[PDB]
Subunit: 211 residues, 4 copies
Amino acid sequence: SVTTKRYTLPPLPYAYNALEPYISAEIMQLHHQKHHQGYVNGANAALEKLEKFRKGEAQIDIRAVLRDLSFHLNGHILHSIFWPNMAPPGKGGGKPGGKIADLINKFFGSFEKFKEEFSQAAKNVEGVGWAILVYEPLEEQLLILQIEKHNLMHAADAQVLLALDVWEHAYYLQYKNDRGSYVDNWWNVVNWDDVERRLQKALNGQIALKL
Amino acid sequence: SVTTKRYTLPPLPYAYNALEPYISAEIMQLHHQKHHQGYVNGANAALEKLEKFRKGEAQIDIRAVLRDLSFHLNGHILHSIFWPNMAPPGKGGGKPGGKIADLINKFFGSFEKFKEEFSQAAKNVEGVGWAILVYEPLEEQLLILQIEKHNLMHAADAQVLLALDVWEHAYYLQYKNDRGSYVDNWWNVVNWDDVERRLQKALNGQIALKL
Amino acid sequence: SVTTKRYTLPPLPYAYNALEPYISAEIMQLHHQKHHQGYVNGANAALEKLEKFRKGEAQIDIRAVLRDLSFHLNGHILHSIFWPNMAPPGKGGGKPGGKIADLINKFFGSFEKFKEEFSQAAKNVEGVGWAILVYEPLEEQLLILQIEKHNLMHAADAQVLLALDVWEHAYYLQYKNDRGSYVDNWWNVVNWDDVERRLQKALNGQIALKL
Amino acid sequence: SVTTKRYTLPPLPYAYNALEPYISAEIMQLHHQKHHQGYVNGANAALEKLEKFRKGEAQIDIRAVLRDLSFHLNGHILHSIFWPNMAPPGKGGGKPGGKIADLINKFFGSFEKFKEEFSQAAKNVEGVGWAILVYEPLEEQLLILQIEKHNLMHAADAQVLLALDVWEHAYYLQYKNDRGSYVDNWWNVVNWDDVERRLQKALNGQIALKL
Ligand SMILES: [Mn+2]
Ligand SMILES: [Mn+2]
Ligand SMILES: [Mn+2]
Ligand SMILES: [Mn+2]
């Protein structure tokens, strides 16, 4: 018996227009319905090829399919964090509080310095990718990392707490080439409650999904 | 107030010659004292630059330093797993048992198919890198991934259970260009108890470290 | 005495709206005035850092600056080919003639199959990048390659004859996520005379950039 | 009619032990007979898959195959330049003369400054790769570039004049982890005559191969 677990597109936690004016309904719709859906589809396509190989039903270029899986699986995972990382202005935006504020102050000095560091990491991704805030479980610290594509430069075992997508399709329709203004405006929709919930799990030595 | 947590070289769980003749005493000594040491130093060097930056003390090429951090931090994590992943012949090397055996059977059909898929993965790494078995927490399944260098193609949030280093320095002194037979002999030193300990943590929703 | 030669943005060979309706004037303006200009600026910035190093005037993270140079210099070179690779419909579009048609038939069987393979390569670039047709001088043959970002997967010494940009900024404002329709519409503006001129140089074992 | 031109392994210009004590006989033999042969084999295997698709004979993962082709073709091209780039001690490996010396002085200030930049580039390659010196035809200057694997970070259209392999298999049997002393010692075998012939070709606007 051989099984693979398949992936599905999660619904947004809010309406397509809920993050306006900071991210347009048009972007939200395309980004979720087309781009995120495509990564779910691609991940499942790679799994089907692997399962067929595991069954002894077909051959496989192992490198090619695992490269494909890594790309799409990561697109799916990062977007799945990205949506609840944001919230309509009110629930979204402003400064953090609770444990996340304290830990940000601890490792980065202040929220202002963290904001600068995270923004600069996002603005300076070469090509397409992400800025992420992770909890590194080995020495138990917050780190900012750049991710290229969806799958390059992750820290093994690390838990993603906050993710900012700087693929051109995350902003181009509204901001055009001005990724900087997009990054700066995105702070207005950060759902700190979600980031806090992720950090709480991470601090307890747990995987920070499925809140 | 700014802090960063620094990394340290862990001792091997055994002697340098404990994995002989499957992997050389010379390789063990160089691999750990020189190669793994380098990654610790590299990670700490990156942290210093970030810490200095966070204090508004110096400037930074944030892309460069985060690239450096990603490479070296991953070097340090993967090797930190790699050593206890192995055990002296007898204690190490056999067929899996418990939950790891059953889940391997569930997703791959048999241990034989898994062993084939994992070996194909390790032998077909383009350039230097790793073959890894992860627990993927989103749909809760085992996956094999190829890693290039130390930091390319990880699955975000996923827990590393088993890792094989196929960087040339992991084998060349003993096996020369013959990576295939190095991968083949490595099975004889696999510590299935360690992998089981990591899988149980992952199943618990915990980080597969510290145990 | 230390010198570096600096790069400059070439003017377009036609008006911004000359490729309508296949590529909008809005895209052409941003793509040239912002995106291409940025690569020129980035390549010159990396050179100034290298020049300061060569003067013994400043220290340098050599890996970082050389990665930066490679990215930007390639962005500049590929865009510099991209623009004259296209022409207003009439001069642009249709099927190739002369030596290019013959060599396409020799290596690909027909212009139909070539166009199929080139379009598929473009559509299937993972993340951002290019499809290119090159002359490979060592064994003297046409090859299609996928380029990721601007600088990943080029053939050393090979001459670029035809280049198609599939970075999202090349099409997103007009075609949104539908890269496939962008790729298909682009054939209508291909400047075959320019491709022929490049092939003519490459066939004599010449560098095929400046004619 | 569909054709692909296939590749072949070139003989070394000298005996395996001809570069001792700087690069060992054992290394020269494995490096050429095993590693370089593998790249020739891989390039032809990829071309066979492409040829089969062009005839409409089989389906293809165009991204996978073109990735494979890029890696192995570049392996083959760079190793082909690598061997004649070197010569037995004395018989070639001191300081450059003629045009190569003049342009090195022009762009790097002096040979000593060039040597430092080239050495530093090679020593600071992350993972496996190359340091190369290229003639960049757009602004007609010399540049040093780092290459990762065989195919990452080349400059489109540029002509490779000098290549230094820093893949681990290029030095590990003799130098172990000490890549630095290998890079330092390689200068004793550089064939500046070969480099000069490549430069003159690039200056003529020719591809820097076949002589
Ligand atoms: Mn996205
Ligand atoms: Mn290692
Ligand atoms: Mn572009
Ligand atoms: Mn080599």
